[PDB]
């Protein structure tokens, strides 16, 4: 393991071979686990030299070594990635994509992935330099299965970074050019390719309805639903996120998710041991119950109300919070019959128990569900019958103490509930 000083010497020699030996030595240093001396290599002014070696077509070994060395530097902080880009590395790396040498092309893929992964500005700059055509050409084979596994995973991951951040989101024509290939990857058998593919789709669906639409039009929902029930957490997580983003769109878009059979997967998702899965499953449910009355009926038919009642009863506070939203949306847009069914499932007790929460936000969401529920009772003149259940559980108190509160909306609704159904 050479010293940075010696590496500088080798690179400064006008000896191609000496430069090769010094670059490899640089690569090995930047490969350590114990904090690679990235900042020193940068201050030493080596980046421009490395970028220069990327263009030495007659010495592929130094193309590889320097590509690798640059990749690890680009894998650092934004300041470090910026250094690589500032060195002119982008067009040099795109030129390597078409190298007859797979290991070199692969490093270029990897390098661009880290550059694009720094943020939207670098992501777009990489796109402006025309990285998309070359990248897509690499996956231009009839059956993905004939590609080396490790190589396919790298490309997938890099394409994923080209889909990622939101300020701004990737260029629309870039997304369109990418989608077809991305969809082939979403249908591939490698568990890692499947995971990153799902992350890419989850990014493309994090935005305006128009964004969700171009992904939905590619018929990916059914595959997403299938992945939604995979046995690997790494696949489930991004699939559920993508599903979650899609149900934030139009009711027509949400219906594609329900038609694909997504709801049958929620019994296990809403009881998943993984706190995060449970929380995003409930979130997804709250945007489904915010749909039409016929979609709320689908929630009911799949027997998901008891599951919502359960999560609201016992779960991480953040999961319970989404549950409240789900119930408030359900109570807000559902029929009288659907709301009655909700009460027969036992929503009152656990909903009351949450009024003690120390989070003003969940108290407003719940008092809202209570208003909604009473409003339904009113059409059944069974108001008084509910007004007792809420006393029973011991809610008449919490709504009572919620009069003498602090946040207006709260004691405004609290009080409004008292004088009208109780006192």
């Amino acid at each position: 393991n050479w010293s940075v000083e010696d590496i500088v010497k080798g690179i400064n020699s006008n000896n191609l071979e000496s430069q090769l030996q010094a670059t490899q030595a640089a690569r090995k240093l930047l490969s350590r686990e114990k904090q690679p001396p990235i900042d020193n290599i940068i201050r030493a002014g080596l980046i421009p030299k490395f970028v220069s070696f990327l263009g030495k077509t007659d010495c592929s070994p130094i193309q590889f070594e320097s590509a690798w060395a640059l990749t690890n530097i680009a894998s650092g902080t934004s300041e470090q990635t910026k250094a690589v880009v500032d060195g002119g590395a982008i067009p040099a790396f795109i030129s390597l994509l078409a190298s007859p040498h797979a290991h070199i092309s692969e490093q270029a893929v990897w390098a661009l992935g880290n550059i694009a992964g720094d943020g939207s500005a670098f992501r777009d700059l990489v796109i402006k330099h025309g990285a998309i055509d070359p990248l897509l050409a690499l996956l231009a084979v009839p059956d993905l299965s004939t590609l080396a596994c490790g190589y396919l995973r790298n490309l997938t991951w890099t394409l994923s970074n080209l889909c990622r951040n939101k300020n701004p989101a990737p260029p629309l024509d870039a997304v369109e050019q990418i989608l077809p290939t991305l969809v082939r990857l979403l249908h591939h058998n490698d568990p890692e390719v499947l995971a990153d593919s799902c992350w890419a789709i989850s990014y493309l669906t994090d935005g305006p309805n128009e964004r969700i639409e171009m992904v939905v039009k590619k018929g990916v929902v059914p595959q997403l639903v299938k992945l939604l029930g995979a046995t690997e957490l790494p696949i489930v997580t991004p699939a559920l996120r993508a599903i979650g983003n899609i149900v934030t769109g139009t009711d027509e878009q949400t219906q594609k998710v329900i038609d694909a059979g997504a709801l049958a997967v929620f019994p296990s998702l809403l009881t998943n041991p993984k706190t995060n899965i449970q929380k995003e499953a409930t979130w997804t449910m709250s945007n489904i119950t915010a749909g039409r009355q016929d979609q709320i009926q689908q929630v009911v038919n799949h027997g998901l109300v008891p599951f919502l009642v359960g999560v609201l009863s016992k779960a991480d506070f953040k999961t319970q919070k989404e549950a409240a939203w789900a119930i408030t949306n359900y109570t807000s847009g559902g029929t009288v019959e659907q709301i009655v069914y909700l009460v027969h499932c036992g929503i009152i007790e656990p909903l009351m128990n949450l009024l003690s929460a120390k989070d003003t936000k969940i108290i407003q969401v719940i008092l809202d569900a209570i208003s909604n529920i009473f409003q339904a009772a009113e059409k059944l003149g069974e108001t008084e019958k509910l007004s007792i259940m809420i006393e029973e559980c011991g809610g008449l108190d919490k709504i009572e103490a919620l009069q003498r509160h602090e946040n207006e909306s709260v004691y405004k609704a609290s009080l409004n509930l008292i004088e009208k159904y109780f006192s």
Binding site: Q24, S31, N72, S75, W110, N161
Partner: peptide, 10 residues
């Protein structure tokens, strides 16, 4: 987000 590589060596 970002990932570095490390092995080989000749």
């Amino acid at each position: 987000g970002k990932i570095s590589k490390h092995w080989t060596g000749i």
